[PDB]
Amino acid sequence: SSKIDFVLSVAGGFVGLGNVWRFPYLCYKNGGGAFLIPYFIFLFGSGLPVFFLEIIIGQYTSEGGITCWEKICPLFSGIGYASVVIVSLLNVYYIVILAWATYYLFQSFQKELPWAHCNHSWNTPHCMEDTMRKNKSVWITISSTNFTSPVIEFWERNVLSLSPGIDHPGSLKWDLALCLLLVWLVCFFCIWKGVRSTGKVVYFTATFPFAMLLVLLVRGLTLPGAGAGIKFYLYPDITRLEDPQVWIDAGTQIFFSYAICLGAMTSLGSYNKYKYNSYRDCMLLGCLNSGTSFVSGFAIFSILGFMAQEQGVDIADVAESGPGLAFIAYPKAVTMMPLPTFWSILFFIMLLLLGLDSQFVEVEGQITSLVDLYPSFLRKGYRREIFIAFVCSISYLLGLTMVTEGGMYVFQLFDYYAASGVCLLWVAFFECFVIAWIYGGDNLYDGIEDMIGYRPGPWMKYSWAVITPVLCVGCFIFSLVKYVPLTYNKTYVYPNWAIGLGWSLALSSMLCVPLVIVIRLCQTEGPFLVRVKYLLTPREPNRW
Numbered sequence: 418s419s420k421i422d423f424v425l426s427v428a429g430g431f432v433g434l435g436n437v438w439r440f441p442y443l444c445y446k447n448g449g450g451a452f453l454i455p456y457f458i459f460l461f462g463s464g465l466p467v468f469f470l471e472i473i474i475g476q477y478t479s480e481g482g483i484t485c486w487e488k489i490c491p492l493f494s495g496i497g498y499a500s501v502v503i504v505s506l507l508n509v510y511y512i513v514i515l516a517w518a519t520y521y522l523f524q525s526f527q528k529e530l531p532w533a534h535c536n537h538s539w540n541t542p543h544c545m546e547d548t549m550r551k552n553k554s555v556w557i558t559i560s561s562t563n564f565t566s567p568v569i570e571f572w573e574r575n576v577l578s579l580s581p582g583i584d585h586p587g588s589l590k591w592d593l594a595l596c597l598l599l600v601w602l603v604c605f606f607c608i609w610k611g612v613r614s615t616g617k618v619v620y621f622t623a624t625f626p627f628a629m630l631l632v633l634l635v636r637g638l639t640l641p642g643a644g645a646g647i648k649f650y651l652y653p654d655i656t657r658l659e660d661p662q663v664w665i666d667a668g669t670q671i672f673f674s675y676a677i678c679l680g681a682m683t684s685l686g687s688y689n690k691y692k693y694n695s696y697r698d699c700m701l702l703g704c705l706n707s708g709t710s711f712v713s714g715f716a717i718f719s720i721l722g723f724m725a726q727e728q729g730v731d732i733a734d735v736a737e738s739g740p741g742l743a744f745i746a747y748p749k750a751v752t753m754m755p756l757p758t759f760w761s762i763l764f765f766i767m768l769l770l771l772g773l774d775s776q777f778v779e780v781e782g783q784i785t786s787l788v789d790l791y792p793s794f795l796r797k798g799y800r801r802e803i804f805i806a807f808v809c810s811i812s813y814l815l816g817l818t819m820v821t822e823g824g825m826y827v828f829q830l831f832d833y834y835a836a837s838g839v840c841l842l843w844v845a846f847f848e849c850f851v852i853a854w855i856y857g858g859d860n861l862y863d864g865i866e867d868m869i870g871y872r873p874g875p876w877m878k879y880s881w882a883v884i885t886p887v888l889c890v891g892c893f894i895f896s897l898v899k900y901v902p903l904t905y906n907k908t909y910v911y912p913n914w915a916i917g918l919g920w921s922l923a924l925s926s927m928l929c930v931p932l933v934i935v936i937r938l939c940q941t942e943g944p945f946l947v948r949v950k951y952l953l954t955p956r957e958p959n960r961w
């Protein structure tokens with residue numbers, strides 16, 4: 418029957434740019450092995466339980482993020498508002514990764530891939546072919562004067578034209594701005610047309626990324642130096658765990674790949690029927706998502722090991738410890754691959770297919786949720802379409818700050834602060850806090866038992882009550898006690914203003930929870946304690 422195999426292909430995609438592009442870069446920046454220990458702890462202690470929580474709240478209440486929270490606990494409706502703010506910021510920068518992929522795809526159509534060789538305008542006199550780096554280039558006859566990879570030069574110089582600092586915004590790169598518009602135009606048209614159902618080709622869309630990843634994985638494993646990369650990736654370095662960043666990055670990557678804390682999962686749960694075994698699906702899909710990231714990591718690290726031994730440099734220093742590692746490692750593998758142009762086109766098409774799907778869903782979700790806040794006004798037939806255009810246009814302009822020559826720096830701030838980090842922990846802690854301690858985890862378990870058919874094991878409630886709170890709060894405090902500034906590629910120190918601006922992006926979402934609480938307390942009438950009590954009590958969430 419293969420009912421199980423059918424649902425995964427049809428349900429929420431278990432691959433995204435977070436698997437292919439966010440996970441490898443965060444791992445690498447944090448050491449290969451160490452990152453994995455907090456990552457798996459978070460996956461089982463917070464990630465999977467929160468994922469299931471969001472799906473079931475949505476299923477129990479039959480409502481999306483903003484409205485579901487109001488039913489479960491009225492005073493905590495701010496969690497839904499915060500999720501919308503986080504989604505709005507994510508949509509602005511997630512599409513920038515796609516604009517880079519589109520640029521690489523246009524570049525790919527040439528007979529010779531630009532990143533493959535070094536005789537080009539962007540290339541510095543330092544750049545040397547990687548085969549040459551080991552052979553007579555590095556401290557052999559003339560000592561290596563900081564020689565660099567053609568692929569790295571293409572990314573930093575042709576694609577990014579990286580400025581010295583966020584302080585120099587530089588010129589708007591017209592080519593990346595046009596690529597961003599193309600990605601945005603596709604997004605608007607698919608959302609406006611309402612092209613959300615692709616029953617016949619959903620299979621190709623699901624299979625294509627996995628097939629491409631398998632080819633990349635085989636290429637890497639067959640590449641000399643793969644074992645060293647796999648060891649770097651697999652073997653943990655404990656000293657790293659003593660740093661707050663590895664924990665925050667690992668736990669948050671779990672939250673990122675899962676789309677938890679964005680209000681997407683509550684909405685997906687709402688679509689599910691009341692009597693559905695969502696618990697089985699959440700476990701399968703969450704494990705598959707994490708499994709994809711874990712396996713993709715083998716591919717990328719085997720290539721990094723190869724690059725490290727060709728160049729003759731440490732695996733840690735071979736490629737960027739920043740967003741853009743995928744743009745260096747995977748393109749290099751393609752060059753090694755026979756018929757490179759063909760593989761490059763496929764990889765960037767895959768990157769595009771994974772990202773676009775996610776972006777369409779996220780932007781539709783943002784727009785729908787925003788329309789729902791004021792439905793009568795925004796349900797006029799023209800007005801919804803105008804709203805979609807407005808959201809797409811405003812997000813495109815903000816994205817323009819990131820397609821400038823100093824825009825990579827702005828992108829790193831957005832990736833670190835806007836939809837990841839303390840903001841995700843804050844929303845997750847609150848979702849777990851309210852369900853576990855206000856609504857009552859056991860009370861939810863009565864409802865889950867009715868919906869799923871069987872009472873769930875003690876793991877979900879313990880995670881909501883203790884493990885997720887302790888992991889989220891502990892990581893937040895640890896980061897503050899041992900504070901380390903965001904640094905781009907390990908060598909760039911962000912100005913103090915930039916860190917404050919990044920904090921504001923994190924804070925805007927975070928502040929929504931306390932601010933709404935205050936608004937609710939004021940609006941309700943009565944003695945303070947009575948107000949709090951009424952606001953705490955659930956508004957008929959069973960909806961039988």
Ligand SMILES: CC(C)CCC[C@@H](C)[C@H]1CC[C@H]2[C@@H]3CC=C4C[C@@H](O)CC[C@]4(C)[C@H]3CC[C@]12C
Pocket residue numbers: 583584585586815818827918
């Ligand atoms: C998300 C939106 C609404 C608010 C945040 C926008 C931030 C992240 C973006 C938008 C414009 C960007 C700025 C663009 C131009 C400048 C002036 C320059 O001399 C220093 C960099 C600086 C100051 C950038 C910092 C990052 C920046 C402020």
Ligand SMILES: CC(C)CCC[C@@H](C)[C@H]1CC[C@H]2[C@@H]3CC=C4C[C@@H](O)CC[C@]4(C)[C@H]3CC[C@]12C
Pocket residue numbers: 520523524592595596598599
């Ligand atoms: C805004 C809508 C119409 C989409 C526009 C897309 C077009 C006009 C943009 C987006 C990506 C751009 C390309 C990006 C890469 C290259 C390869 C380079 O060696 C020559 C320029 C060229 C060929 C650019 C030409 C203009 C371009 C194709």
Ligand SMILES: CC(C)CCC[C@@H](C)[C@H]1CC[C@H]2[C@@H]3CC=C4C[C@@H](O)CC[C@]4(C)[C@H]3CC[C@]12C
Pocket residue numbers: 586587588589811814815817818821
């Ligand atoms: C609706 C609102 C948020 C749109 C805001 C668009 C802003 C964030 C984007 C769009 C166009 C961008 C500008 C394009 C060109 C320049 C000239 C350059 O010498 C300084 C940076 C600057 C000034 C960019 C700053 C960021 C910028 C102003």
Ligand SMILES: CC(C)CCC[C@@H](C)[C@H]1CC[C@H]2[C@@H]3CC=C4C[C@@H](O)CC[C@]4(C)[C@H]3CC[C@]12C
Pocket residue numbers: 913916917920924927928
């Ligand atoms: C929502 C509640 C918990 C407020 C939390 C605010 C805390 C966690 C945030 C908000 C603003 C942040 C500060 C913003 C700017 C700077 C200057 C620089 O030296 C980095 C640290 C520091 C000092 C940040 C530390 C953490 C910070 C103080």
Ligand SMILES: CC(C)CCC[C@@H](C)[C@H]1CC[C@H]2[C@@H]3CC=C4C[C@@H](O)CC[C@]4(C)[C@H]3CC[C@]12C
Pocket residue numbers: 498502925926928929932933936937
């Ligand atoms: C409870 C009912 C009345 C809904 C109230 C929603 C209000 C209180 C919430 C929802 C969205 C929230 C806003 C979302 C955007 C931002 C980010 C930054 O620019 C300042 C805070 C601010 C402005 C928030 C303030 C509080 C806010 C306006």
Ligand SMILES: [Cl-]
Pocket residue numbers: 435436440670671674675706707710
């Ligand atoms: Cl992940």
Ligand code: NA
Pocket residue numbers: 432433434435771772775
């Ligand atoms: Na994706």
